[PDB]
Design a protein around this ligand. Structure first.
Ligand SMILES: *[C@H](/C=C/CC(=O)CCCCC(=O)O)C/C=C\C/C=C\C/C=C\C/C=C\CC
Length: 257
């Protein structure tokens, strides 16, 4: 009855999530854990990187620019998903924009974990795999950035969350009343309240053996916030260090605050 409505909401969010994101954790996992057709080309070095373009400025700049484009693309996909969450589109427009700008990076860092393994990260829609060591190898400050996302992913991946779990979790992240500058907090919190209940039910049904997964997943939010803070502090270095490097408008607007 009450639980049925929550199950329906969970089903809804899963459906929109599959439609919203071309690459899912199930696809990512099947490519990473091996499948002769799904196997990715691996870039661990400059020669492999050079080879990679044929199969799929500066090496550090070109790679960093590739990420930028990817992040812009993710923002667009996350923005469609946000539109799907019941009640989100009904909120004041300014708030929707505010939720989107604060929410989107946390979601992005969360989704990236599904592509990550301790050794590496999937690229080009799973077509390629880029090694963690190579990314670290890159000259400062570009090389440094990845290290926090890998550390998060290995821990976050330990939860063994399903794609349906993730979808509900990403909705909870987007619908956060705390965000700075929100005109109305109450309509947002009610939706979040509904979503948190759906997550709780989903986690217990989906991982009945797993104990206090809900609380552990909620605690995970702190690590996302920290990741974002480091990233922003790093973006500031890049702008000074390279006057020639250019940041995408969509990305720039969200960062500015
Ligand atoms: C890019 C690393 C990006 C850093 C990040 O996690 C998001 C924040 C940076 C952008 C910003 O918000 O300012 C490397 C990771 C993935 C992309 C790598 C190469 C590009 C090719 C494909 C994109 C990867 C997956 C999509 C299929």
């Amino acid at each position: 009855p009450e639980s049925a409505d929550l199950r329906a909401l969970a089903k809804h969010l899963y459906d929109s999530y599959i439609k919203s994101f071309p690459l899912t954790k199930a696809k990512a996992r099947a490519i990473l854990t091996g499948t002769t057709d799904k196997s990715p080309f691996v870039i661990y070095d400059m020669n492999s990187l050079m080879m990679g373009e044929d199969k799929i400025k500066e090496v550090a700049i070109r790679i960093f620019q590739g990420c930028q484009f990817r992040s812009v693309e993710a923002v667009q996909e996350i923005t469609e998903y946000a539109k799907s969450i019941p009640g989100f589109v009904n909120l004041d427009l300014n708030d929707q924009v505010t939720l989107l700008k604060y929410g989107v990076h946390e979601i992005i860092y969360t989704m990236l974990a599904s592509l990550m393994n301790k050794d590496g990260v999937l690229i080009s829609e799973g077509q390629g795999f880029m090694t963690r060591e190579f990314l670290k190898s890159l000259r400062k400050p570009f090389g440094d950035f990845m290290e926090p996302k890998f550390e998060f992913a290995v821990k976050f991946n330990a939860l063994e969350l399903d794609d349906s779990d993730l979808a509900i979790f990403i909705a909870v992240i987007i619908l956060s009343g705390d965000r700075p500058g929100l005109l109305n907090v109450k309509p947002i919190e009610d939706i979040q309240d509904n979503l948190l209940q759906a997550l709780e039910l989903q986690l217990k049904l989906n991982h009945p053996e797993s104990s206090q997964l809900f609380a552990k997943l909620l605690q995970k939010m702190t690590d996302l916030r920290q990741i974002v803070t480091e990233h922003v502090q790093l973006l500031q270095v890049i702008k000074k260090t390279e006057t020639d490097m250019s940041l995408h408008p969509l990305l720039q607007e969200i960062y500015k605050d």
